[PDB]
Amino acid sequence: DLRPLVPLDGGRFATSDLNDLYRRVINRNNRLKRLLDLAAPDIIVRNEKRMLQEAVDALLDNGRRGRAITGSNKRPLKSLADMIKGLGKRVDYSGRSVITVGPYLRLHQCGLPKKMALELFKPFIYGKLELRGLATTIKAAKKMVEREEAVVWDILDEVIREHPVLLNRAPTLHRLGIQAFEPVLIEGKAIQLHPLVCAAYNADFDGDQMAVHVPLTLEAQLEARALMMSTNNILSPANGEPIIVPSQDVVLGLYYMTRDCVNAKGEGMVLTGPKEAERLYRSGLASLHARVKVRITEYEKDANGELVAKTSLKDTTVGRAILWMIVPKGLPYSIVNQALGKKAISKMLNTCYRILGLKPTVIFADQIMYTGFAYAARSGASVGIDDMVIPEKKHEIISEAEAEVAEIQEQFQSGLVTAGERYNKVIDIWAAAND
C-alpha cells in the first residue's frame, strides 16, 4: 500500500514508478532462469546476467547508471534513494485571515470572528451541548449546531472563556514569532490585533495573513499560559531594552503634548494640581502648551522598601502636568520634563520596568497608548504643499557651482590638467555644494 494502484475517476489509473521497476527486475530474472535451464550458448547468458545486473542496480539507486527512463513521458523516474533523499507537516485546527488594527482592547486579547471560532471549537461545543441537557446525542448536536439556533452562542461564549490560541505570522524569523493570546469574540471577518505588538512581528497592515492554531490538552494549555503569553515577553532576547516601544502615531501625539510655546492663551497663572490642569484644558480656556507653574507630589522608595512623600512648586507646562496623571508612584519627576521624543520614551518604560516589576509596566503601557491616540486625534497634524519650503539660496549656489565646473573644463581643454584629476575635482565641487 506504500506503492498503491488507486483508481482515478473514470477508467484511467495512477501509480508510483516502483511498479514498473519491480516488473522489469522480475521479468529479467524469469528470463534468465528460462535461458539457463535450456543450456544456451555463452554470449546470450552473459548479456542476460549483465542486463539483470543493470536492472537491480537501477532499482536500488537510479542515477549512477544510464538512467532508465519510462515510455510515454520523457521524465526520469525515481526509486528508493529519492524516497529518502527528500518543508511541512500539515496540521488540523488551523485557519488564516487578513488583519486589521482595533485599538480598543488590552495587550493580551486579540479578536476572533464568530465563524472561525465555530469551525474550530466544534468538538468542545459537541461535548458541552450533549452534557448540559439540550440534546440527546451527538447526532442531535450536529443537527442543532449547523442550522445555527440562538442557544449555541452562549455555549460558545462559555467555552471561549480563558482558553488560549496561538497567533503566528508566515515567514517566522526569530523567537517572538509565536506568541499566545486569549480571544474575544467579535463580529466581522478579520482577526483583530494590537497596535503595540505589531512592532515585533515586522508586520505591516497592508494585507498580511496570520494563522491561528489551538492547543488541546491540559499540559499544553497550562504551558501556553505560564511560559509564552503576550505579557511575559516584553524583554527582547537580543538585548536589554524593551521591544514595546510605540511606533507610528502615538509618538507624534506624545511629542505634541509635551512642548513649550512662548505665548499661548492663559499663560502665567498658577494652578493647584494635575486634576485642575486637566480641567483647565477641557474648559477651552488655556491652550495645551504654555509655561505655567504648578505643584506636584513625587514618591520615592530609596529607603528600605518604603514609599516616602514630597511636595514642591515646579516649573512646567500644562501638557506634562496632564501626562503626570498616568505614571505610577515609583518614578521621579525627571522623566516627564523633557521634550519626550522616542529615545526618552524607550528609557521611561525601561526605568519603570527596572524599578517596580511587571504589572505597573503593563498598565503603564496600555495607558500610554490610549493617551497617545486621543491627543494625536485632537491635534490634527497634517501636511499640505505649502510646508516644503525650498530655500532662497538655490539659484545662486547652483550658479556658482555651474561656473566653476565650466572653468575647470576650459582649463582641461587647454591641456593643463588630466582626465582623472579633472574627474576628481568635479566630484569634490558638487559634493560640497550639496551639503
Binding site: N47, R50, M51, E54, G66
Partner: peptide, 10 residues
C-alpha cells in the same frame, strides 16, 4: 564529490 560501461555497446 571532490573538494565504456553501457550494456548496448558491449
Amino acid at each position: 564529490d571532490m573538494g565504456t560501461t553501457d550494456p548496448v555497446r558491449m
